[PDB]
């Protein structure tokens, strides 16, 4: 996260770190949606152009964390993966369309002050909140700028951007399964995700019922925090039928 600030303790209890076993490193962000399911970006697991193809056994899920590097004894919980499910129409070739994957954990995670699931939106949540100008929150342990790394989880709030502006910012084809967010150059505030934040959540707090909803998944940007560029996020509600299908089957 570029130009964010340190998260407060327990501010994002759904935040998950995907942690690579060997070499021991930050793989990506993720989010806890139930005691056994974690949501992330498909490209965190599978992206052939960068030779990324992780299997269940390659990584761990670390929940309840704050510090990037410490083993937070009695606070974090570390879980193993039972199975990975990548959207079958994830389009890694062209534009990361449907950049979404679910991971089932081997055992339920116990909830605590530090560990708690986020809600997924339904159609009415999406229609109410996914509006140009409305702000969401992005959190992660990724890089502090494009070209170092945070001591603790970073947070930034960022406005949703009008679809024509998003499209006009890039030569990549943007789909209805994506939205973009970030400040315009004139706005005089900054902030973005960056390397290692992919797969993490873009959340919004419903003013109707006072719950947090995961509206997006950190997907991709052209660099980090560049003027006239934006962050592209997987539209969670548009892919929710798939989410429900996988969770109902498995």
């Amino acid at each position: 996260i570029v130009e964010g600030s340190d998260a407060e303790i327990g501010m994002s209890p759904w935040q998950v770190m995907l942690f690579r076993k060997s070499p021991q490193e930050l793989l990506c962000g993720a989010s806890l949606i139930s005691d056994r399911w974690v949501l992330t970006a498909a490209h965190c697991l599978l992206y052939p152009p960068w030779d990324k193809n992780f299997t269940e056994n390659d990584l761990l899920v670390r929940i309840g964390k704050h510090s990037r590097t410490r083993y937070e004894r009695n606070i974090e919980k570390i879980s193993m993966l039972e199975k990975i499910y990548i959207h079958p129409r994830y389009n890694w070739r062209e534009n990361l369309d449907r950049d979404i994957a679910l991971m089932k954990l081997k055992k339920p995670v116990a909830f605590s002050d530090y560990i708690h699931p986020v809600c997924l939106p339904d159609r009415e949540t999406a229609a109410s909140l996914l509006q140009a100008g409305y702000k969401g929150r992005v959190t992660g342990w990724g890089n502090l700028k494009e070209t170092g790394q945070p001591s603790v989880l970073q947070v930034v709030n960022l406005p949703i951007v009008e679809r024509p502006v998003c499209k006009d910012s890039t030569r990549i084809r943007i789909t209805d399964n994506m939205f973009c967010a970030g400040y315009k150059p004139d706005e005089g505030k900054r902030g973005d995700a960056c390397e290692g934040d992919s797969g993490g959540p873009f959340v919004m707090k419903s003013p109707f019922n006072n719950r947090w909803y995961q509206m997006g998944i950190v997907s991709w940007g052209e660099g980090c925090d560049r003027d006239g560029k934006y962050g592209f996020y997987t539209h969670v509600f548009r892919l929710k039928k798939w989410i429900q299908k996988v969770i109902d089957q498995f």
């Binding site: 076993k21 021991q24 410490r70 083993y71």
Partner: peptide
Amino acid sequence: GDFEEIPEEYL
């Protein structure tokens, strides 16, 4: 060794 070691049970 950027990351602190994990208990061995998780590996």
